[PDB]
Design a protein around this ligand. Structure first.
Ligand SMILES: [Ca+2]
Ligand SMILES: [Ca+2]
Length: 295
DNA sequence: CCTAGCCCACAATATTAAGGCCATCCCC
DNA sequence: GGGATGGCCTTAATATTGTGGGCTAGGT
């Protein structure tokens, strides 16, 4: 029906676990509490989110913006489903720490304890270390938030669990693109390369290393980059793309809007492999393909 | 009244999708 | 060594997580 590791991979890429504490005097604490699991996608991926909706058997899909939709689960009863899933197919990235805090928050909630002052203070303390933390509104309303705040759970990376996790994740958080460049020394005075990359935040250094080892690219100790904010890898060696990247994703396939892109990626790979990118007709073919990708 | 169900829609910054150009390879 | 690819480094414009707000119903 729907591979469960892909779902965890896609969720590592795309989901978010929020606990919203919204100011509202119609409530007895002055605050409403909203637990939200959410994946936001372009309107073009409504069918992917519908598949996810049936797989889980819970959740609703709503208009999210001019050309976007959101799959949302906000009920504590229905969130039992999404929690059970991840207990069985755990998040691989640091998101797992946001998830752990979301669980703790949800216990306060399932026990109606968020409707007391003691419970609210607990949630502020949990929310302090969750995603973007407290807005200004909460810091004003709870000046002692620093003391309430809880230790972010520490995150040690235990590895890639299943090849489907990779395609789930890559479906949301990888890039397939055409790298056009000037070439003085070539007869066309222009040049093409294919590029597959994944760019994450530096706290995922270990994951980026585990990924490059998984594809069998780790050879040489390079094409991996650690900027101060970003850990990244990019494959541009045509043989590496042809023999390691494509064969993987032919088997564990990219899903959603990025598959239209993977498909064009391969079209271009077919043109290069046949040396037709050295003719101007072919190089235009590629430029035309490129224009229509990711855009 | 006091709550959650359900829905639409913004924010700012991490991400996504590239682009420049030196180093290096190899068929010839 | 002409003609091509590999790889390190850089970056803009805005999707992407993450969030904010309000209408509604139902129990008590
Ligand atoms: Ca992501
Ligand atoms: Ca993504």
């Amino acid at each position: 029906s729907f591979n469960p590791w892909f779902l965890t991979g896609f969720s590592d890429a795309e989901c978010s676990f929020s606990i919203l504490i919204q100011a509202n005097s119609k409530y007895s604490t002055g605050w409403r509490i909203k637990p939200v699991f959410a994946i936001g996608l372009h309107k073009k991926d409504n069918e992917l989110l519908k598949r996810i909706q049936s797989y889980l058997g819970v959740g609703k899909i709503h208009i999210h913006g001019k050309d976007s939709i959101q799959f949302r689960i906000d009920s504590p009863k229905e969130l039992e489903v999404i929690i059970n899933h991840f207990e069985n197919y755990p998040l691989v990235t640091a998101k797992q720490a946001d998830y752990t805090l979301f669980k703790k928050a949800l216990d306060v909630i399932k026990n109606k304890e968020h409707l007391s002052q003691k419970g609210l203070l607990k949630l502020v303390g949990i929310k302090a270390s969750l995603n973007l933390g407290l807005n200004g509104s909460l810091k004003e309303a709870f000046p002692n938030w620093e003391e309430l705040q809880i230790d972010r759970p520490s995150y040690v990376n235990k590895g890639i669990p299943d090849p489907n996790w990779i395609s789930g994740f890559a479906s949301g958080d990888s890039s397939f693109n055409v790298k056009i460049s000037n070439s003085p020394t070539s007869l066309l005075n222009k040049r093409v390369q294919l590029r597959f990359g994944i760019g994450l935040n530096i706290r995922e250094k270990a994951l980026i290393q585990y990924l490059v080892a998984y594809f069998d690219l780790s050879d040489n100790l390079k094409n991996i980059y650690f900027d101060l904010n970003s850990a990244r890898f990019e494959v541009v060696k045509f043989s590496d793309i042809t023999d390691k990247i494509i064969p993987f994703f032919d088997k564990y396939s990219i899903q959603g809007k990025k598959s239209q892109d993977y498909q064009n990626f391969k079209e271009v790979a077919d043109i290069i492999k046949s040396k037709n990118h050295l003719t101007s007709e072919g190089f235009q073919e590629i430029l035309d393909i490129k224009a229509s990708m990711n855009k």
